Ligand binder design. Structure first.
Ligand SMILES: *C/C=C(C)/C=C/C=C(C)/C=C/C1=C(C)CCCC1(C)C
Length: 137
């Protein structure tokens, strides 16, 4: 596997519906969907250590983790969480999240590198699955 790359989004499905489950009100959801049309993910992978930088027009966030080792990040709607990534196969990993404070929907995400060179991200909140597809710049 080599997830390393500068990835640009080409497709985004069910993102609005994901934000709805997470309690985001409709006007902000629409504005968020619009910001997702621009967004980029930069990955540097060495072995099972990942550096991931997610950026939109006005905001950028960095995620650092090692597979199998708990780390802290934030949920999609911004609530801090404890995360743990595991491989599910050669080119797919899955992250389970646990809220640091309080309660809410069960969230998770996955990243997969397809055989045709796409990166597929999924983000889940309860029953709702958002799928986003990226290609290398
Ligand atoms: C491993 C790759 C990951 C975990 C990517 C995570 C991406 C996000 C949490 C994106 C969030 C966004 C919003 C919360 C609203 C603005 C648009 C996005 C898609 C950047």
């Amino acid at each position: 596997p080599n997830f390393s790359g500068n990835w640009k989004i080409i497709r985004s499905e069910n993102f609005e519906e994901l934000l709805k489950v997470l309690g985001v009100n409709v006007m902000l959801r629409k504005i968020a969907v619009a910001a997702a049309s621009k967004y980029a993910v930069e990955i540097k992978q060495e072995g099972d250590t990942f550096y991931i930088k997610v950026s939109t027009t006005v905001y950028t966030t960095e995620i650092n983790f090692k597979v199998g080792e708990e780390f802290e990040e934030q949920t999609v709607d911004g609530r801090p969480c404890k995360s743990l990534v595991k491989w599910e196969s050669e080119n797919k990993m899955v992250c389970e999240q646990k809220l640091l404070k309080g309660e809410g929907p069960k969230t998770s995400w996955t990243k997969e590198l397809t055989n045709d060179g796409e990166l597929i991200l999924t983000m889940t909140a309860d029953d709702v699955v958002c799928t986003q597809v990226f290609v290398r710049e």
